[PDB]
């Protein structure tokens, strides 16, 4: 409710400084009590950073800020109540913003794990994720009205570059710590990092996201290969290794539920531009998410481990999907639903890119490839089928709607008819057909109504077990 400026003014500010600096000072020590305690402290710290009107990280520019004890109170005052006489001396233990960002970088490029930088991940990063947006709104790059713009110099120096660098470093940390068995901090860091993604620059995609999703896709593929071999060989030892593949599934689903909930937002803001001007990186991201969705659909275990992760970790996912409603400011389905699944949500978000890849003419071949997938024809088999039936491509003169669709298709700068080649066409038809296929089974699984459970029999048999 943006009450901080009015509320936290003099003595509430003093108390907030004391709380802030105590929580930050707590970082150095290592204890089991501290480890179990940190997440609540970091959450409180983030909320306090968001609410606090002063920019404690950027003190040198405090003289501009009006909502500060130093400006409000005369030097005669502040002698009655002990002060250092300098907002810098407040509490020096907290480093400046540039220093902290440099530290987080250095750690991320070094490859530090959670054990080396547990204080940062649990406490500092949420504080920065809360600080940088609020002060970006009040800082340069804010939409300035003429008078407020000309008179006071902004206290904050925050810019979108800070947020972009922080997001890249966070993704770097996650990629460093993907493989580890125990990463509980992932969900909390992702939730805290959601806000800053809005200001992420386009280059972040190619720089960070594509490699991350590619690595996750490779890991998924290895895991499915192990699952296929395990199904091929039937033994009690085959029942052994089920545990291994499920543990791999669970850690993989943890990595995905860490990474995608950030990406979905990045996609939402950049989807319009990707559709307006086609982007090869966007197409490749669609390919990765589609491959992961195919693995999800084919592997029974992967779905169950996703579901177990969601239920045990109480991940609602409604905040990830709908949080923009919160920013704009006006149960088993809520627990787990396939709609909630971040895999299908991300695939549906990126699907328009895949559809834009395919020209309107390719719809007929797409349908044929979907039928072949229903015949269970493999990737190469649908490819050769498309080679055989390439001539079938739809007729612009024959169809009226295809006329204007294809007119728009040329209207796109990146899409030219001369550039298209048979191999490109058959490939994109194959990809879109596989995605649409598996999406149709996901959307209508038929698991419901296959064996209806009115549980009248279960009730009648409760008396029987009695």
């Amino acid at each position: 409710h943006q009450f901080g400026d009015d509320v936290i003014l003099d003595d509430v500010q003093v108390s907030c400084y004391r709380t802030l600096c105590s929580i930050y000072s707590l970082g150095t020590t290592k204890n089991t009590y501290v480890e179990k305690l940190r997440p609540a402290l970091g959450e409180c710290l983030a909320r306090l950073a968001a609410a606090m009107p002063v920019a404690f990280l950027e003190p040198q520019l405090n003289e501009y800020n009006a909502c500060s004890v130093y400006t409000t109170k005369s030097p005669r005052e502040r002698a009655i109540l002990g002060l250092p006489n300098s907002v810098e001396e407040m509490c020096p233990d907290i480093p400046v913003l540039d220093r902290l960002m440099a530290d987080i970088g250095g750690l991320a490029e070094s490859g530090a794990r959670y054990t080396e930088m547990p204080h940062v991940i649990e406490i500092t990063l949420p504080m920065l994720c809360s600080y940088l947006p609020r002060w970006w709104e009040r800082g340069p790059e804010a939409p300035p009205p003429a008078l407020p713009a000309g008179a006071p110099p902004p206290c904050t120096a925050v810019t979108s570059d800070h947020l972009n660098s922080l997001l890249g470093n966070i993704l770097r940390i996650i990629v460093n710590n993907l493989g580890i068995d125990e990463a509980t901090w992932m969900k909390r860091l992702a939730v805290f990092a959601q806000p800053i993604v809005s200001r992420a620059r386009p280059e972040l995609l190619h720089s960070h996201f594509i490699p991350t999703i590619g690595r996750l896709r490779k890991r998924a593929g290895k895991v499915v290969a192990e699952e296929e071999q395990l199904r091929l060989e039937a033994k009690a030892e085959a029942e052994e290794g089920e545990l291994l593949v499920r543990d791999e599934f669970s850690v993989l689903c943890r990595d995905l539920y860490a990474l995608y909930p950030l990406l979905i937002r990045y996609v939402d803001n950049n989807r319009a531009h990707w559709l307006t001007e086609p982007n090869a990186n966007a197409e490749e991201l669609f390919r990765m998410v589609g491959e992961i969705f195919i693995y999800w659909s084919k592997s029974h275990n992967f779905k169950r481990e996703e579901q177990n992760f969601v239920v045990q970790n109480e991940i609602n996912n409604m905040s990830f999907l709908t949080a923009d409603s919160k920013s704009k400011m006006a149960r088993r389905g809520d627990r787990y639903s396939v709609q909630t699944s971040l895999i299908v949500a991300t695939l549906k978000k990126m699907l328009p890119i895949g559809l834009n890849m395919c020209a309107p003419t390719d719809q007929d071949l797409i349908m044929l490839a979907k039928t072949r997938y229903a015949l269970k024809d493999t990737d190469e088999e649908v490819r050769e089928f498309l080679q055989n039936n390439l001539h079938l491509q739809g007729k612009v003169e024959g169809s009226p709607s295809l006329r204007w669709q294809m007119a728009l298709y040329r209207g796109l700068p990146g899409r030219e008819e001369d550039a298209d080649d048979p191999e490109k066409i058959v490939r994109r038809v194959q990809e879109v057909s596989a995605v649409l296929y598996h999406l149709e089974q996901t959307e209508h699984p038929y698991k419901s109504k296959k064996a209806v459970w009115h549980k009248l029999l279960s009730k009648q048999r409760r008396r029987a077990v009695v």
Binding site: L275, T276, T322, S325, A330, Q339, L351, W404, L408
Partner: protein, 903 residues
């Protein structure tokens, strides 16, 4: 009997933004003058003759809509009782042309100057042609609203408005006491030429749909300061008041000094200086007196508001910190009266709003005092003539004077606080003006029912130029114009003023738009869902739903629909040009939605809700009103009875009902020069016809009006009384007085039942049933009334060819209200004879099926013309004035209903 077809040219009306009226306590000058000069006229650009009329029109009720209208169309000045016009040869009012005599008579031609004069006092409207008097006047017309200059034209016209001063130069001297219309130009507004009640205007990308305009009322100019008669003044509030009087006087004097005013032995306006400057005593007493009355009005106003005032701190009351004027400054006086310091005093936002309200009241009090003195408003200041630019209520006042009166009064409040009198405002109470009904305020634009879709996936866009009340969505073909969109099952709509979605009520959904935002509406009949997007992003409920509405039934079909509130502008794109769509590719194209008009050679035809009330047959299933046709008996004639189904029940609707019979009686073209057994020859040769209305017992006659209405009646007033009735008198006379003719024309002729009733302030309830009889002589054009067989004083005279419908206006007070009794008095024919040719000589009363009761419905669906006249408006020059040009013809085939005389 048969519908008639003919080709008619379109007509358009242009006015300046001058609005003048008369009201008690009004700030407005009564007499006004303007001119129109004809540069070019093409008599016959089409087969139909060119249209050019100049006149005055009333803000309320002058709603000329393109194409269809009264008579054969071409609605302009004088085609309604609200407008009064001159064509060069005739004076037009009520769609009647009355020839008027002028030297060198001719239809308006190039190089002709028409001078129009309005005297609200009489009231009278007069014309001069090329400086030569026009021997006819409009008088005795209604003053319910403001008056504005107007020209109505077809294509083939170039004319210029001359409004005086810098906006045009008059070729002929205005008659004495008549102000040029440019003087009426208001502070907050600049002079312009605008269309009247437009629902459409051309835009850069495409046409904009426009909501109803917000128009001022003649009451608005009347200041209404809060009453200060009941006042109790504490003694310390008496002297303190004088203290602030002198304090504000001194502060204002100094302020004038800092702005540079000096001392003058004499005073003058342009000079900018005031003689009081010299000392707070030495200044004249009348200034002190004036400041004292207003200082008291301040305290009395605080009391009237009821804010609690109390002496907070005796220490500050006893000791007053004194500002010291800067020593550096030097003044002819040499001595400055030190006011209290303003810096130490603090004001809260509530005090700021109180300051605004008190400044409003003070300015309104000043305006009332000046009005009592006889001052009036004028954009140009003439002290000798008592015309001031600032003599306008605070709302219409300009921002600069608003700020000056603000600031002064906030410093006055800080002075009170410096004395220490703490003031606590009372809680604010919301109020709803309801100056205009939802009916007129809301316009609905929908696609034509031919374009209804019962299948597929469709997309269309709506751009919001304004951020105010507008709704966009999909509607069923049987959408009722009356209902606000989405209140009923008929519409599936989204309202971004508040971020709501409407179907059978309102639920929060999405986010409110901002100016320039585009709403993409998509309907998927295959999945039976509706989706809304804003600027390319899907709107979400207070939930994860991507769909505003679900499980929709296809039924008859769906249509695109939008609704605009007053002062709202939208742009509707149905996809005839796919490139025009901004956000279609971002959302909808890949999903496969097709634009509503993707393959259409012609733009989609639209229909809009039109607020003109028209008579429609009472629905058989109308929940509240029932009409029963009774057969004639030996004792009783045939009758049509009205009953209230839901009377004496929760949800009962009690409101004014305007009813008329379907078929009229027509007066003869040429008026004749100069036992109870009917006499055959008398009854056969009589031109007199009769009907009666029986008001039942329990139905208050005071709530009933009986008589006739002309087809042009369109006035749907909840607070109806005979005063609201339109009326105007056309007077034609010789060059030297000697009035040849005076004709009174009105749309409604009626008698109030309270006139007939014997006084019943005591014993008001009457078991007896009242029976009001209406008689008309077609040959003499005379109309008379009978109370219970007793002749009433009221009588009317009408011109030949007049059509009159039996009409009853009633406020129900009982389940059984009225009967239209179609019967005959001895030696008088019933209405059947007059209505039907075959029955002209049949005295036997009859009620055929065609004769039916019709109730007034305020709003109706009206087609939007595919093409509209292109009018060029400019300012040719300071001397030339403003210029209006139409050159490209438009014609429409018009279907004419003869009985209703409408097209």
């Amino acid at each position: 009997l048969l519908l008639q077809t003919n080709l008619i040219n379109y007509v358009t009306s242009i006015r300046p933004n001058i609005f003048v009226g008369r009201a008690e306590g009004s700030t407005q000058y009564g007499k006004w003058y303007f001119e129109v000069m004809v540069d070019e006229v093409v008599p016959f650009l089409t087969a139909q003759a060119t249209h050019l009329r100049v006149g005055w029109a009333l803000t309320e009720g002058y709603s000329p809509y393109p194409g269809g209208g009264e008579g054969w169309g071409g609605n302009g000045v004088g085609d309604d009782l609200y407008s009064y016009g001159f064509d060069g040869l005739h004076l037009w009012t009520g769609h009647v042309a009355r020839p008027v005599t002028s030297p060198g008579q001719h239809l308006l031609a190039p190089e002709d100057v028409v001078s129009c004069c309005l005297d609200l006092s009489v009231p009278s409207i007069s014309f001069r042609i090329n400086g030569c008097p026009v021997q006819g006047v409009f008088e005795a017309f209604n003053l319910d609203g403001l008056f504005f200059p107007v020209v109505s034209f077809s294509a083939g016209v170039k004319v210029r408005f001359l409004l005086g001063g810098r906006h045009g130069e008059f070729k002929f001297l205005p008659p004495p006491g008549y102000a040029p219309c440019h003087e009426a130009v208001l502070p907050r507004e600049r002079l312009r030429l605008e269309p009247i009640k437009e629902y459409r205007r051309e835009g850069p990308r495409g046409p904009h749909l426009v909501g109803p305009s917000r128009c001022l009322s003649h009451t608005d100019f009347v200041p209404c300061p809060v009453d200060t008669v009941q006042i109790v003044l504490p003694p310390h509030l008496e002297r303190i008041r004088e203290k602030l009087a002198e304090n504000i006087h001194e502060l204002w004097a100094l302020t004038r000094i800092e702005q540079g005013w000096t001392y003058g032995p004499v005073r003058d306006d342009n000079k900018r200086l005031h003689p009081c400057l010299v000392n707070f005593h030495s200044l004249p007493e009348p200034e002190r007196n004036y400041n004292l009355q207003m200082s008291g009005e301040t305290l009395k106003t605080l009391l009237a508001l009821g804010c609690h005032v109390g002496m907070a701190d005796e220490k500050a009351e006893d000791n007053l910190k004194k500002t010291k004027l800067p020593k550096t400054y030097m003044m002819s006086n040499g001595y400055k009266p030190a006011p209290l310091d303003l810096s130490h005093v603090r004001l809260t936002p509530a005090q700021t709003t109180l300051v605004d309200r008190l400044a409003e009241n003070g300015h309104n009090v000043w305006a009332r005092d000046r009005v009592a003195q006889g001052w009036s408003y004028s954009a140009v200041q003439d002290i000798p003539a008592r015309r001031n630019p600032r003599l306008v209520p605070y709302r219409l006042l300009d921002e600069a004077t608003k700020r000056s009166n603000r600031d002064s009064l906030c410093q006055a409040v800080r002075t009170l606080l410096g004395y220490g009198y703490n003031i606590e405002p009372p809680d604010q109470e919301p109020s709803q003006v309801e100056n205009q009904s939802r009916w007129d305020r809301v316009r609905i634009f929908r696609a034509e029912k031919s374009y209804t879709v019962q299948s597929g996936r469709w997309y269309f866009e709506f751009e919001a130029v304004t951020t105010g009340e507008m709704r966009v969505g999909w509607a069923r073909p049987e959408l009722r114009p009356d209902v606000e969109l989405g209140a009923d099952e008929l519409a599936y709509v989204f309202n971004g003023h508040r971020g709501q979605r409407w179907h059978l009520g309102s639920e929060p959904f999405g986010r409110p738009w901002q100016s320039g935002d585009v709403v993409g509406c998509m309907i998927d009949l295959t999945e039976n869902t509706i989706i809304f997007t804003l600027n390319g992003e899907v709107l979400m409920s207070d939930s994860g739903s991507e769909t505003a509405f679900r499980e929709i039934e296809i039924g008859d079909g769906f249509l695109p629909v939008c609704s605009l509130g007053p002062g709202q502008v939208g742009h509707l794109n149905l996809g005839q040009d796919v490139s025009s769509l901004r956000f279609f590719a971002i959302c909808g194209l890949q999903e496969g939605f097709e634009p509503f008009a993707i393959n259409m050679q012609r733009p989609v035809t639209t229909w809009f809700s039109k607020s003109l009330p028209q008579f429609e047959p009472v629905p058989p299933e109308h929940p509240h009103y029932e009409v029963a046709r009774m057969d004639g008996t030996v004792d009783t004639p045939p009758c049509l009875r009205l009953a209230h189904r839901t009377w004496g029940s929760q949800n009962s609707l009690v409101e004014m009902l305007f009813l008329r019979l379907s078929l009229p009686v027509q007066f003869h073209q040429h008026f004749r020069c100069t036992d109870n057994r009917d006499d055959p020859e008398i009854i056969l040769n009589t031109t007199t016809y009769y009907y009666s209305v029986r008001v039942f017992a329990g139905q208050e006659p005071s709530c009933v009006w009986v008589g006739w209405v002309t087809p042009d009646y369109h006035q749907h007033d909840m607070n109806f009384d005979l005063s609201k009735v339109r009326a105007v008198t056309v007077t034609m006379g010789d060059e030297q007085g000697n009035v040849h003719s005076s004709l009174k024309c009105s749309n409604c002729y009626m008698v109030w039942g309270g006139d007939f009733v014997s006084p019943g302030q005591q014993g008001r309830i009457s078991h007896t049933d009242l029976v009001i009889g209406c008689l008309v002589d077609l040959a003499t054009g005379l109309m008379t009334f009978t109370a219970n067989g007793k002749e009433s004083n009221t009588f009317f005279q009408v011109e030949p060819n007049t059509k009159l419908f039996p009409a009853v206006f009633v406020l129900p007070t009982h389940q059984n209200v009225i009967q239209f009794e179609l019967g005959k008095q001895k030696n008088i024919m019933p209405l059947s004879a007059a209505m039907f040719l075959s029955e002209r000589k049949n005295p036997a009363p009859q009620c055929p099926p065609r004769l039916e009761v019709q109730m007034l419905m305020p709003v109706s669906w009206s087609r939007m013309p595919n093409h509209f006249l292109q009018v060029e408006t400019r300012r040719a020059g300071e001397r030339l004035g403003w210029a209006v040009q139409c050159q490209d013809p438009l014609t429409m085939m018009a279907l004419h209903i003869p009985e209703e005389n409408r097209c």
